Symmetry: D2
Subunit: 423 residues, 4 copies
């Protein structure tokens, strides 16, 4: 047992009567002009209003949202608030206050620049965080990093509350306050991992993504999606596609129908970097969860190659891996073409679900290291995808046992649309 105890300093309750805790934000619209603020109040429902104003302008405005609550087995939640601030300006710092009529707390965020071809952005990559001491040091190596992350693409598995007796949802609240120091100030883009299914019918809890969906909203209707568990956002020069590994994706299902139609919406002249987020990797040579992503691979891989996805980011496997550019899309049951071959139109598959979880690393790998695999290692850490312009983006992996400025693995992503060089 390596999760931080309940009295740990990261879980300290903010002082004040009905003081907002678990404050977290993510993108509110498709293009970054909106932001959705979320927080929990414990002592009474409280106001869902959010006071915000820009850094040097100070015209204080108010946005109204909605309160909701949920129960899980024995656990009754605090009063959860979700509020969307809209029509914000690009490249502008804002302040926002929350808990307006009782104990107010103020936070900050900087909206991204407007969607554009040559607009740089620094995305952090954090996967399978949990709330162990390893979870805390990874969040630390991230906030201290010289390259300065502006949004965290989170590839799934958040709290691991479901590891506790009856999924002790108090450990949802503790994870909420723990991550607040990062997610209250810059957006985290949510994808749903297996530890968010929380399908526990043996305690009459049979509705999937029950607590995760109540606590973490995404702007899924902005991309015409009919579920929060797959959606799309555009930010700076990135077009980001988030899939649900544990929702349906057969032919005709909504997510399948949505992804087919969203792919051909992508405009690489406006967003050169096509980034796909999912939880379970389609390419992974570790023994843990080996070949689990094969089902989705049969359904979606040829579309990734068809639309030249730059990179696919997954978690689930508690280690780090980086494939070569390969595709396994020629198999026809009896023709023998069942081996991945080098394909300059294929994405790079990176597994970055090594932020700590409950404190265990996946170290047993299939040996020998297959040819489709570039780099792999079982160490805790996080990733950084730093878009420079339309042709270059520098990815880097930071180990938890290294200094915050040390890159144990780094590659130049050459854009599949504007600069498809061998990499």
């Amino acid at each position: 047992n390596r999760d931080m105890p309940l009295d740990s300093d990261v879980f300290r309750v903010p002082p004040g009567y009905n003081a907002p805790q678990q404050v977290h934000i993510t993108q509110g619209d498709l293009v970054g002009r909106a932001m959705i603020i979320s927080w929990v109040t414990m002592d009474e429902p409280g106001s869902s209003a959010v006071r915000y104003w820009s850094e040097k302008n100070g015209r204080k405005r108010i946005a109204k949202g909605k309160m909701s609550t949920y129960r899980f087995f024995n656990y009754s939640s605090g009063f959860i608030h979700h509020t969307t601030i809209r029509k914000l300006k690009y490249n502008t710092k804002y302040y926002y206050e929350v808990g307006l009529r009782n104990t107010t707390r103020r936070f900050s965020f900087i909206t991204p620049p407007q969607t554009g071809l040559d607009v740089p952005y620094t995305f952090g990559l954090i996967g399978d965080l949990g709330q162990s001491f390893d979870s805390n040091t990874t969040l630390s190596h991230y906030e201290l990093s010289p390259k300065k992350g502006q949004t965290v693409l989170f590839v799934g598995d958040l709290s691991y509350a479901d590891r506790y007796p009856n999924h002790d949802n108090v450990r949802w609240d503790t994870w909420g306050r723990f991550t607040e120091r990062s997610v209250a100030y810059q957006p985290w883009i949510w994808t749903a991992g297996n530890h968010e299914i929380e399908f526990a019918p043996e305690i009459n809890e049979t509705e999937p993504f029950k607590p995760f969906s109540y606590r973490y909203h995404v702007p899924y209707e902005a991309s015409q999606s009919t579920s929060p568990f797959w959606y799309s956002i555009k930010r700076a020069s990135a077009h980001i596609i988030v899939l649900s590994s544990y929702s349906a994706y057969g032919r005709g299902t909504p997510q399948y129908t949505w992804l087919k139609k969203e792919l051909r919406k992508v405009k690489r002249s406006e967003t050169p970097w096509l980034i796909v987020l999912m939880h379970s990797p389609l390419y992974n040579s570790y023994n843990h969860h080996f070949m689990e992503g094969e089902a989705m691979r049969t359904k979606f891989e040829a579309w990734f190659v068809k639309y030249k996805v730059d990179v696919v980011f997954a978690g689930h496997v508690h280690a780090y891996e980086r494939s070569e550019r390969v595709s396994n899309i020629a198999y026809k049951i009896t023709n023998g073409l069942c081996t991945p071959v080098k394909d300059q139109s294929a994405p790079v598959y990176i597994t970055i679900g090594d932020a700590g979880n409950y404190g265990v690393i996946d170290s047993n790998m299939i040996q020998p290291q297959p040819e489709y695999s570039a780099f792999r290692e079982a160490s805790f850490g996080h990733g950084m995808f730093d878009i420079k312009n339309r042709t270059h983006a520098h990815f880097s992996w930071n180990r938890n046992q290294d200094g915050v400025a040390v890159e144990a693995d780094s590659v130049w992503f050459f854009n599949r649309h504007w600069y498809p060089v061998d990499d």
Copy 2:
């Protein structure tokens, strides 16, 4: 277009005010002592009470049920009725009446025998029925069959209403009146196909399976399921498992979680025959929907072989095909072990989605016929799985263009747990 016109005789409306229509029955519990009675009233809600009595004794009792309505875009449904009759006795003819308050109508069913190893039973196999003239021929061939089926395992794609403008749900209503002359007297076992999804966000009909799940209910709680789209039923000497090709089946999901624990519950020494139903086939050498069943095969194929399923029935492809007993469960990305090999531990895969649909057949086969494909032919028709004892089952395939008693293909099934011997033709 080849669908029967609206004023066809198999579409006409039962006479009398608020006369029940679209009456269908299905097994209402795990072991076959219950039945779900389902019908619709068009003129007013009416009673959901069901009067029933055995022909032998004959004390007439009432079952209290539930009624529901729904809307699909600019369509408003009539009044759907669902009522479960329980504590029935085995191997007994029962009469039952609906429309008790105005226009009553009488039908009957025969409860199956109690489950035992050697209990014989005839299952009809229908898939992708629709409401074409081809569909009517198949229904007629099934009910004139000399081997007399006692239950229809239906492997998906029912009315094809989703092909009419705005999915004109009136063609759900017509399909109920059409298929009533069979499913009102014997239970059909329902699988959700791809034409039941009806995900239509352009007219904000985004709740998958909404019309199908309103009209056709299913005893999914009896097997501890949390969804109607996957469940199990025991009936005579068989254990049937119905799966949802178009629901989540990833590791850790409800259907995935439900299936692996249901397979552990199967006692072959009590139900010898293990049958699995899905809409999209895992083995399919027809070009239509080629390799669509791969994503499920990657997850469930090894389970079918380890628990030694007897037969997997599917549709989706609008033709017939019987497979050899093969498995493809040794693939490891880089090892090249990706060809189906003979496997006497594996089930036989039958595609049986040639009941008629909207009148087109799938004849573009991948050539040459692959080694995993025993028999295939592009003809409309149905199939029959005839269980004799714990060891033998006779599967035959009847064509619409042949006589009702002619079998153009037949294979004797050796039970995987009681007669583990090669049964290839």
Copy 3:
């Protein structure tokens, strides 16, 4: 005896065109008069709930976003019902609005009121118990033809009488929406719930009180911080209007009772000098039909009305006409014998105005003799007019269906209780 207009009447014709909006009606959507609820129904498919609206002055076309709802009643299924609120309008300007923007649109207009003030003149038409007989149609023709300009209808309950038809056949709600649209699409009607909107029919498994009416006709009840749509307050021009529900609870401690006790405290007679109460069931009524039915709510609310010097209480329910004297009956205490209404110049005038048509029957039988609290009564179909001249004066007038559209069978000058409490008896 069946005096209801047949369905092929010209008042019931369907607006042509694929999914033409119909049953278009408007009512105030705020407290002060800067908002409009635009209500309509589409029969062919859902369609857009969006309203295009602009003023004849500026001309800027803006869009308001609304909400789509449907309902069933027995074997009836409704069309696609739309409610959209237009907000932040300018006062005293004429607005055009368009609805049905995705296929065939239809244009109407309204004139927002002046904003509330002490001497703002305004004309209120008074229609009750309308229904859809031919008599109903003569009344609506007369109000439209009135020489002085009715700017808003205050409706004191009982709209379509669809509940008289077998299974309440709510085709007769659609019929009524189309029938009245010719007036309510261009000036707001302020709705009161009557007994015919209850539609409590357990014998056909239909136990939701007020449902068809509540789905089709919305009110700005949250603007007055009311918890229910059946009691609410609005302010228009120099008038503060309090709509009560005769067929909801009103015991001490109930929401209606609680809400009303507080709402009187908010009245500002120096902003809205005219204090108007609407309720379906009359507290004063000397007809045999529904005699003394108002006695229960009179015991709870009469004293408050007098305490706050209410100017008038308009009611329907009785299918005829009556205007009370300024009387009160608030001194009863079981054993003190004081159960006679007395002259009370602080009390409102009670006017019964439920004679617009209904299913075509008048309530002609009366309590004899005419009691002292009754100042004028007649069993005639007609409609009324409350024309505010200023803070001291307001002219009420009753007009019969059998007279010229300018002939006032009854007419009285209302002297304002807060600003000019002169005796204004018959």
Copy 4:
């Protein structure tokens, strides 16, 4: 002031993991063959199944029920259970059990006899109970009465939890655990009082009767009512009609409509005793809530006389009053007839809301005692309506300052339908 502390013994938590608490039963159907078993589990949801059996047969049954929860402002309830036991034998002792998965608890009840003309039965009448020490004293006098109550007709106002900051619904839990020692073995027939309204729009709790209606169920569908707040049951020789004082009752409203039909359905030839329960008294000569009962009386009083109601019970006034058979139904606005008169066809109106509340008795009476008032006294206590046969019922009032066997007031009821004799 006088509300019993949380550490009191009446509020103690039954021991054991997830032990059922606040157990309380009530008539489950129209005739007495059913019983609604209700309890709250605090540690986890638990099973809503009830295991029951009769002493005559001792064959144990399982009855499945429902589970529910609610929030109120800033309070989150435990897991409320409601299960209906049916087709019970008449006049039979049944044992029932709750908490079947972890901590099991066992209780017992005796079903009433089949409804009949001369079937005796002894009802207790508690009103405005509360949580004070005066409340515990009334409950003691009830359970110690040599007359032995068999069911409680409770004329409303249960916990008074709405007198606490934001109605602190922990005070509903305590009241549940305190009244259990009577209501777990004996059915209480629930009337809704004004302290159940809990209309607190300022903390966005605007659903009237929310905490009450979740915690206490009534067989209101058995008499074709569409609302828990008005309903009727038959029990032994009594037809009992429960009315909702704080709901709509205008002409055409549901409760008005339901009451109109229900009085026409009374068969005095089988249940000759016509009992009506409301919270607000139609007859009251006390200062407190004087004349508040007027509105409903102007609506329902003539019906009560026309159908020969035997007695109407009410609380709300924290005292005791017994009216004469009196009527005030001749008023026609201008005829001056607004003075109650003797009327042997009218019911007796009793105020019995003196069970304790929060400990404040309503002492101030209007003087002198009007003619319609036969007896009145401001003392804490309870009442008993003891049916002997179709002819006779002996009502008696017990004061908490007297012994448990002393009747400070008592009177013999002659049945209005079967014995229209002056019962002065």
